[PDB]
Symmetry: D2
Subunit: 112 residues, 4 copies
């Protein structure tokens, strides 16, 4: 998958497991259409989101839903989800995210 | 204003000046309606976004548009904007954001 | 003070109050000598650390002690303190730090 | 190695390659003695730092030297190195760091 997402938990010092991630792609009419989605594995990583054939040039939004994640862990968080927008046009993108109930950090690692 | 936004630049080590910030509020029909917007001042701060009368309970989205900010500074960034969602229901909220072309961090400071 | 330190708590979404901050300056013999220290106020800010006369060119280390901070709040943290080194030679420096038991972020805002 | 270090570059959106990392362990006399060191590989990762036999309980400091890293890339950074202190006593520790010339973030991921 040319797009991968990795999520860590800053409160517990662990991979964030079973985090829902949704990806959208901007359509010709300026709407966000669902493109791909998944849940992080035990390693905090989300593999197999998309493929090189499907991941064409475009404007993409990656949404990470934190509310459900924190609640299963017994936390009611302030930040409920985080979103980031970028253009695809190097050809492997990793979005690495760090989660806390009142803070998020996201970084793009873009490689060959 | 019960909602304030402060933005810093991690590349240049400065307040991020003239950053466009848009705030949306989720409507009864689950749509994001425009609620408030502004640009950061020389201090990187955005004051007067809203008021206690207007800032009622609800689900809010704060969007920070980085593309225009980086371009005026001669940078074409990878992350184009960042969004965070939270519920309003302490009664002063500060969203502090740190900007880089490949990274964003946002933190909520919620006080009385 | 040409050097200011501001600390936020990412777990609780608040200023980090009463955080001990120590500043060292590298001596001619390559040793870190105590230069200035203080505790953050209710706003999470540490004012009056030093003065323009005292804050001469040099290599400085800012150390932020998190162990005592987290314990008073009932937390036994993994990261016990964080340190950053920079050279002083713009003329107001703010070190802004964000604290979690398993994570720290520090940013320099350097202005006139 | 029960201790691993991974470093990313927030300016360029890449693994930070050839970053010098030094690890110290606090001695009986309260001095920081050199324990282990290495340089990050092309993946931004530093493997083989230590072993389970050598990595006994103690207070450890991980120092990441950014000055040399940024200069080879044509940057003269403000933050010259970052240090974090923790106690070892889960049994695999990953220190993940994100680098910018005016900002650093470090997170501990502690697993089995």
């Amino acid at each position: 998958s040319p797009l991968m997402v990795k999520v860590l938990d800053a409160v517990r010092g662990s991979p964030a497991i079973n985090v829902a991630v949704h990806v959208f792609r901007k359509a010709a009419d300026d709407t966000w259409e669902p493109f791909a989605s998944g849940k992080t594995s035990e390693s905090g990583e989300l593999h197999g989101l998309t493929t090189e054939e499907e991941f064409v040039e475009g404007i993409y939004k990656v949404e990470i839903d934190t509310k459900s994640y924190w609640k299963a862990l017994g936390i009611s968080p302030f930040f409920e989800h985080a979103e980031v927008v970028f253009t695809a046009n190097p050809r492997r993108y990793t979005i690495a995210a760090l989660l806390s109930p009142y803070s998020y950090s996201t970084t793009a690692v873009v490689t060959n």
